[PDB]
Symmetry: D2
């Protein structure tokens, strides 16, 4: 029907000259007590994969897709058929979408709702016969001209109302299709210039908005995990949920912290000047690592590139964080990635996903070994042991004060420290990377 050239993609192993096969991702291979499929919980982004056109700030849409002949609802329906065909052939457990990705917006809200329901009906009775499930859905509060000054942070109370309606419908669809999570991304929730901005009001309203959401979620009995996806900027000059930490500060200020977890996207972390691992670590130690958008940016380019994950250091390092968190739990590895404008052929959708999946399979395999062999843990445990005994243990138990500490410091000679062993640790990481065979 849509992808006729492509037959169902299978795991063929490392020594395999077949471009359309998994070299490392074996869905049922066990890594510890769970299979690769259970560990990785892969998900495809509806937006990039089925509605993306390869357009560029300086280029027109160039993507070649079979469903391009259609318009309107025919196109919406065509994409659903295509979507599920792609899911089956690639063997993906999950997918994600924004409301505007699946159905065309109407001239009035009532219309939008109609088109949406139609498409949701179609999606529901398809899930019926597919292994693929909805990881999370979300409301697109940034693309329409109406959200020009924000959504919940808009200076126009009508826009606040409209955004609320689209999130209300969003949660209903989530409940209906049994989404495991619901994602919020504040694309326009920031500022373009402080000069015309009442920041305290905007933040107050953003909090009021989120409160209303968690309330509605209870009322309809949603029970899926609420997620916030941080980003430093783009489109905005400054986006409010800049960081995992920055968003955390916000949630704490307004007492929304217990209702939320974070959706961390690699490209977003690097754009904030942090490493992907760093953002995962911070989320993790706060018990707020909700889910992951697995992509990769270019660190020499200051905008989102949404590339597929091929860098094995990143995947390894990310997986290490994820495994230590006890896994993704309710979230998954959603490929919020996009083929390069130069990879405009249909088969590139497959090449791209295989690349990302194999890269994460490798990362899972090695991150796991690093953990079971206590490669880094062995050392960390050894270098922090001063806090296990004597004065250190007093500091930790909370039985030390400036008096005792000063008294102690006074009898101290030259303090001796040991190496952080960075080059060694880095060398070790390489050795484990290369021991994938």
């Amino acid at each position: 029907p849509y992808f006729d050239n492509i037959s169902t993609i299978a795991y063929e192993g490392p020594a395999s000259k077949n471009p359309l096969a998994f070299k490392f991702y074996n869905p049922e291979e066990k890594v510890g007590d769970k299979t690769m499929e259970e560990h990785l919980r892969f998900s495809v982004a509806y937006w990039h994969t089925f509605t993306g056109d390869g357009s560029d700030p300086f280029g027109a849409g160039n993507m070649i897709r079979p469903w391009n002949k259609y318009s309107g609802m025919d196109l919406a329906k065509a994409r659903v058929e295509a979507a599920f065909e792609f899911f089956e052939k690639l063997n993906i457990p999950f997918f994600c979408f924004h409301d505007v990705d699946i159905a065309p917006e109407g001239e009035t809200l009532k219309e939008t709702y109609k088109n949406l329901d139609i498409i949701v009906d179609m999606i529901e009775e398809y899930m019926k016969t597919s292994k693929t499930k909805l990881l999370w859905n979300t409301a697109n509060l940034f693309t329409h001209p109406r959200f020009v000054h924000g959504a919940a942070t808009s200076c126009n109370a009508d826009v606040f109302a409209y955004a609320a309606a689209k999130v209300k419908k969003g949660l209903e669809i989530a409940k209906r299709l049994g989404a495991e999570n619901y994602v919020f991304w504040g694309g326009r929730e920031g500022y373009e210039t402080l000069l015309n901005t009442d920041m305290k009001l905007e933040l107050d309203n953003l909090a009021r908005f989120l409160h209303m959401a968690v309330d509605y979620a209870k009322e309809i009995g949603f029970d899926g995990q609420f997620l916030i996806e941080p980003k430093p900027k783009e489109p905005t000059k400054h986006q409010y949920d800049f960081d995992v930490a920055t968003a955390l500060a916000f949630l704490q200020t307004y007492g929304l912290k217990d209702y939320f977890k974070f959706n961390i996207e690699a490209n977003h972390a690097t754009l904030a000047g942090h490493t992907f691992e760093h953002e995962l670590r911070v989320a993790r130690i706060h018990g707020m690592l909700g889910s992951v958008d697995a992509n990769q940016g270019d660190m020499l380019l200051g905008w989102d590139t949404d590339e597929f994950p091929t860098d094995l250091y990143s995947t390894t390092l990310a997986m290490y964080e994820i495994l230590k968190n006890g896994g993704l739990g309710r979230g998954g590895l959603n490929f919020d990635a996009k083929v390069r404008r130069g990879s405009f052929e249909p088969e590139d959708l497959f090449y791209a996903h295989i690349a990302g999946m194999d890269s994460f399979a490798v990362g899972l395999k090695v991150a796991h070994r690093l953990i079971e062999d206590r490669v880094f843990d062995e050392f960390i445990e050894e270098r922090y042991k001063s806090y296990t005994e004597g004065i250190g243990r007093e500091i930790v138990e909370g039985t030390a004060d400036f008096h005792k500490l000063e008294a102690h410091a006074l009898q101290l000679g030259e303090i001796q420290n040991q190496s952080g062993r960075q080059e060694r640790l880095k060398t070790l990481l390489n050795q484990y990377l290369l021991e994938v065979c």
Copy 2:
């Protein structure tokens, strides 16, 4: 004695060809209900001004200073004499210092304390005859090899003890000289690599450390304002108090929030990818704008340059934030700036400070007009008025929910927004800048 060429610097007005005079900073000129001196509360950084040598990662110290002939305690004493001479000639209300700036460290802690006390005695009986007062002092927990793995975040509990002692002595000196504030800067409180880092432990300990400090402060009856100075990185690959917001998250997590306010440094804000104004705004709307380090970096250079503030847009924009905060209160405008390595002559210390002071005088003058003429406020007030009436007011009073908002959105036609008027606002800013005459 030290600066013989230089006579006491006076305000001479705009049309004055004299390089050694204030063109805009008139200590007693009234701007609103306070004089420029009361508004600006200028302070000089002991470190850069009296101990800086113009060294460079690739260059040896090149600064030419009169007190260079001396060594050890003679040098420490010489600098104090020089310091107060400089304060008098420049007419500065305040100064700041790290413990290591004023006295040479000893081979043992007991020695360090002796040298410190000697110099503190000398400083105290000098304040006796000077208008200059101590804005804030601080403990240098980054320069010594002992702090290589952090101070309170060190993996060596002995280093935690040592840091605690130096902060204990720090607070005693603060109490003794009547410092208005006490600053903490976590130069080594971060990481060089996550690979060997137990982040949750380090953060836990940083919190335990700060708790012990606020406890000691109560015990000795300090009552000055505790300040935390954020920075994204340098020396560390990642410094924990990355941001005003990031540090806020930390303080909230450990319940230290009521004891602290922030010391915001321009170069640090830009290094985190924020504008100076932005950091002030965020601090301000949280009632945590404690004090300012008035410098300026180069946005094309990714390290701290600590230049003197000459950019008038920045000074204006910063002052606007400060005035809206109700002023600096207990803090001040500490010139944590440093002359360019090319400006190695003694007179450059004066040229530099005059430049920074005049620039802030201008900024104060125009920021004030912008505020009294309601230039930006007029507009902000107008564009957010939807939240004053009808549905908007319901949202704010907290009497709205997804139901009412959706009901409202359903009867809505095309939503109309108005321009953010950015170019206009920017044009206006220029007009006010140019109306300084």
Copy 3:
């Protein structure tokens, strides 16, 4: 007709509360021996101003324009009428355009040519009754899907042919409408990944392409100035004419240097990690400062923002370079700027241009004073005078060698240098900025 609200914009002076008037740009005010209009040679970018829609990588077109009701050729024609109305009301001497800005592309090249000719006929007989003239035009070799792998650097020789045709027609239109310059921008002339790139071939072909152009220009008797507009990246991961210097290297390698000059755009310079002034200076000292795209980016944002020039330090500093070059000569100050997505009203096109024009008027005024008062020149002349006499003069005349220099160095004691006086120079700049009254 199109802008009914707006009446012809006039110079009203500094103290004028009228938003729709020039506060500093007085077309006929003399600054030295030329009027502001002759100095500034302002130009409007057809693309942003008449075809821009405010779309955003995450947002749909939101701009409100009177000619939006039209489609196809009606829209093309409508825009021409509108364009000239705007030119008249704003009093602009020049404009610029890409072929695709003025007429809709056809399904075949022959069609494209037809539509183009029609619109060119219309433009020509309009210039007939207008003061506005064509500064430069250019061929858009980046927007169409066909240029996905480059134009002259494309791996598809058919695309090379097509690009050549569009540049051929481009030069004919230039000759016909009497363009003063012709601009080349290599938007897709770079790479997305080195992995599939034969760089030496691409560069060889880029040179062959440019050679063919200067040859055709001679054949048809064009005689306008060829210009190359550098940019580091975006859309490309790396664009070949990265820099003024990088492009220079290229032109020198292939002997195209005498035929070209540079079109420098502020945002592009900052994106390459240079200051606007820097790029102008480099071009200038090589006699290759051809023309300017007067915009401004955000240094905290790593993509082109194309803002209107409001920063007065930049305009002053740029104008200083331009005046020292002996003026723009054949080029001009083309506003390759774009209103913020938040400034979506028609009147913002006017506010924006007024802002940019006044900002450059101010910059011209003060840059000129700096030059006539020899503010910086006085000093530069003094600090380099060692090369005027003795050994220095020998070095310059070329009568010195390592022998004499070593002999000299051997008899030298401690070398004495003097301050670079940076803070002083910066302070001075401010004083002149503020003396605009």
Copy 4:
């Protein structure tokens, strides 16, 4: 004597739990027709390895080294003994140094020369019994206060003379010890501010300086390869030889191009916003890839970090460029890297170098396979074949013009392009990385 713990480091293979052994670098393993040792031509940087102290812009020297007990010439001599011991134990073919690294500077030039000669005598009669040879030496024209305004670009002609003398002596030492290359790095050859800079003069003088050098080199009969090492900035706000391309432009302008080749350092390339491979590629296609400084920076940190190369993608990708250049020829892989301040123990010097050497061994191994299997070449050859036949071949032979190309374009339908296959190529790269076993 110096490194007693450490015994001579040997190649032990991949499965080896010994931290002090090569896992991948086997000096005599053949890769193609040359052994790993002949291919890699490793070199150690005297400066970082023997004179580095781990100091930091905010930290004192913390490095622990056996020769620290000594001062003056005893220290200089001690380091030479240590240096050669290290070379032997690590089995390094080459080393590099700045004049100031090996001997202490005197109070007068005559003194400096004496100390230098003494140490050079010692080095010479040590090379006598060692396999290690001098890859290249250089003159340090940035560390001394005298070079504050540049060296050859200094505004003080006495400094130009002094720099010339130190370069003259530099070339004599090179000739004497048989250096294969001589490196120039313009650390202070740039500007801190354009405001006081006569750029054309500075550049003119830089060229005069380099001319005098190549002349002296001929006079004394040096015959080693002159190298220029580009860098964008640091210490300077802008360094003149910003880029490989920028430096190329300079050399072309002054006709120095035939005498020079480039020394490319990874961290410098990334700092200019280019990838390491990119800089090598550009140099390479111009026949100017002279030698390499093998380090690695952090792309989230905007200053030189000089880390040891552990990232295998980089080493692979760099080696691919080097192999295609026909190897390093006369240059080598000089570890201009430095241990992290946290790796302050003596044994870290070994861990660090092993890490870098193994990483490059791996890179050599896989880069070679990529080349022999024509992995990328196969594809590049296929996608550019339009330039082999028909119109394409005409373009290349130089028998095409705008007329023929337009005529051709006119008969063209829809142009068809094929995928750039980026994700595929990236996936392939991973497969080869993982096939190192």
